Structure formats: C-alpha cells, structure tokens
Assembly symmetry: D2
Homo-oligomer: 116 residues x 4
C-alpha cells in the first residue's frame, strides 16, 4: 500500500464513513487524469488505491467529496470538496498516508510519509 487516505469527522468525533475519494495524476498536457478512486470504510480509511508499480513519481491530486458527506448528515457545508495536491518523490520514504480532519467550514490535512 504505497497510498492510503484517512478521513475523520471533527463534529461527531468519528471516522468519516462512505466518503467518496478520487485520485488524479497530472498528465504531460497539464490536465488531471483519473488514477484511482473509492469510498472510505467504516474506519474512515481507503486502502488498495494503487500498487508500487503504478505509483510513479509525479504530481497527484486527492479529491475528497466533503460536501456530499455533510449533506447526508443534514449539515450545510462551506467547501465543494477538499483537495490535496502533492508530488510523489522516490528519494523520500515509501508509503504515503493522506489524512484529513473535516468540519463544516474547515478542514485540516497532513501527510504521513514513512518507510516500511
């Protein structure tokens, strides 16, 4: 698992379950091409997005559909989505965790990059 996404809910103090997540890779013509996607599990996590072979150096975008998440809870949110844009670099540690902590008008995101 070179890439994992984890999403938490700061209002309820829980994992954010069944949140849609889309990953894109920047193409040579500077457009975003679909790369991988899924929905967070009951632990707020999305595993199995890619493989080491497929996850080469490049610029990636992780788009978390926060608006649908809040609307399903009956809460009007601010953002259309949360976007996390970063470069994957081989010199750095192997495994990337992209974490996001969600509130209706705010989000935090951090990267935990470690060596297996």
């Amino acid at each position: 698992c070179p890439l994992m996404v984890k999403v938490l809910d700061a209002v309820r103090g829980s994992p954010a379950i069944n949140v849609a997540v889309h990953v894109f890779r920047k193409a040579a013509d500077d457009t975003w091409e679909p790369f991988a996607s899924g929905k967070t599990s009951e632990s707020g996590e999305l595993h199995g997005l890619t493989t080491e072979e497929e996850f080469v150096e490049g610029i990636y975008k992780v788009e978390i559909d926060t608006k649908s998440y809040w609307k399903a809870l009956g809460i009007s949110p601010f953002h259309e989505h949360a976007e996390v844009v970063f470069t994957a670099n081989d010199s750095g540690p192997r495994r990337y965790t992209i974490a996001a902590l969600l509130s209706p008008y705010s989000y935090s995101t951090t990267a935990v990059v470690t060596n297996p």
Copy 2:
C-alpha cells in the same frame, strides 16, 4: 472587503508574508477562469482582491501557493499548494475570509462568512 485571505506560519509563529494567492471562478464551460490574484502583506493578509460588483454568484477556487513560500524560505514541503473551493454569494452577497495555517507537511483552512 468581500473576499479576504489570511495566512499564518505554524513553524515560525508569525504571519506568512509574501504568499502568492490566485483566485479562479468556474465558467459556463466548466473550466477555471482567472478571477483575481495578489500576495499577502507583512500581516499575512491579502485585501483588495475583488469588489462587490465583480464578486457575483459562482464556484470559486482560492489557490494559496504554499510550496513557493516554503521553498523561498529554503525548505522542501509536501504540498504543491492549498486549494479552497466553495460556492459564494448564492443567497446574496456575503463577506468571506479564507484563513490558512501552514506547516511543511500539513495545513488547515477555515472560512469566516458574514452578512453585511
């Protein structure tokens, strides 16, 4: 000010000065049209991006150029930028403050929305 951006640096405990900010608005053909840009002052604030007349209903993207900020300070950060995407003024004119708190591998953003 209908739209203001404020940026803080969590490493130095200071405003984030001379941070470039680009604002885009989604056009009728679904592309991101350049809308306004500027850079943060010594107080970490960016005022004067737009006017009440210009700042119509729409979907807006505020791109904060965090990578260039950390690199101009001689540090190699994780993200390319921080993006904040939101619908504005769809219930009439509001004042928006987009605030961000930056670290090299993490950022937080929140919105303060007031009715004049």
Copy 3:
C-alpha cells in the same frame, strides 16, 4: 496589546462569540495563580487582558472555556476546555496572539509572536 486571544467556530464559519477565557501564571510555589480573564467579543477577539508592565516573564496558561461555549449553543462537546501553556517574555517583551479554531470533538491552536 501584549496578549490577545482570538477564537473561531469551524461549524458555523463565524467568530466564536462570548467565549470565556481565563489566564493563569505559575507562581514561585508551582501553583497556577489567576492572572486575567475576559470573554470574546462579537469579532471573536479578547483584548485588554493585561498591560506591558503586568505581563512579566513567566509560564502562562490560557484556558479557553470551549465546553461552556458548545453547551450554551445546545451541543455536547468532547473537551472540557482548551489549554495553551507557554513561557512568555523570557527574551524581553513580546506581543502574543493565541488563536483557536473550535469544533465539538477537535480544536486547533496557534501562536503569533511579534517583537515591538
């Protein structure tokens, strides 16, 4: 202002108004002595806590009464309060802003420290 506190609400996208704040200073016997208190204004800010003369070197604790804020809004939050503990003025007088961003099960705090 040698010491200012600013508080935002991540659920409502607004300043956090009428939040009680208590400041303490560690005494020579290691106990926490009451130092100053107040509540945030309509802008979410609390000014006038202390003076340059009064705000000597020491270890200070700023207690932000988040539970009472969420409960006065009719919500049951996780934390009792948010505490911010720091040494101040040990290299001479500085200006301190303690900022906090609140959600029912989470909060963020940062400091902006400037030299007059």
Copy 4:
C-alpha cells in the same frame, strides 16, 4: 484498549516518536492524580495505558511533552506541552483515541470515539 494516544509531526510528515505522554484523572479534591504514562512508539502511538476495568467515568487530562520533542530535533517551540482535558462517558462509544498533530507554534487535537 479503551484509551490510545496518537501523535504526528506536521513539520517532517512523520509519526512523533518517543514523545512522553502522561495521563491524569481528576480526584474528588479537584487535584490531578497520575493515572498512566508512556512514550510513543515508532508509529507515534501509545497503547496499553489502561484497562476497561480501570477507565471509569471521570475527567481525564492527557499531557503530551511537546517541548522536549522539539528540543531534541533542535527546534525552539512555543508550548510547554499540549494538554487534552475531557470527560469519559459510558453512554458514548467505548474506545477513545486522542490524536495530536504537532508544529513548533501550533497543535491540533481531535478525539475519535468508536464502538468495538
């Protein structure tokens, strides 16, 4: 494991390893009594603090020694420590995760409370 603590480093994008953590329980005389302690592991986590039998309803304080962590990295930080104060309540879900994301002048904390 009714109580787990997880600590992340927002500057390096890594778990915060070997961070001292102390847990206290509020006594009837309103003083803080030591309850459990340890150091975070190579994953930034501290497990095994308490048992279901021992972790009764009450007010608890988790104190994370952030100052020593930053000093060991050669970084001058702002806070003496990060403190998280909360009530344990049986009506709510069983397992508490207290997470903290650290920067030199800022920290975020959230609670993830779930049902096994």
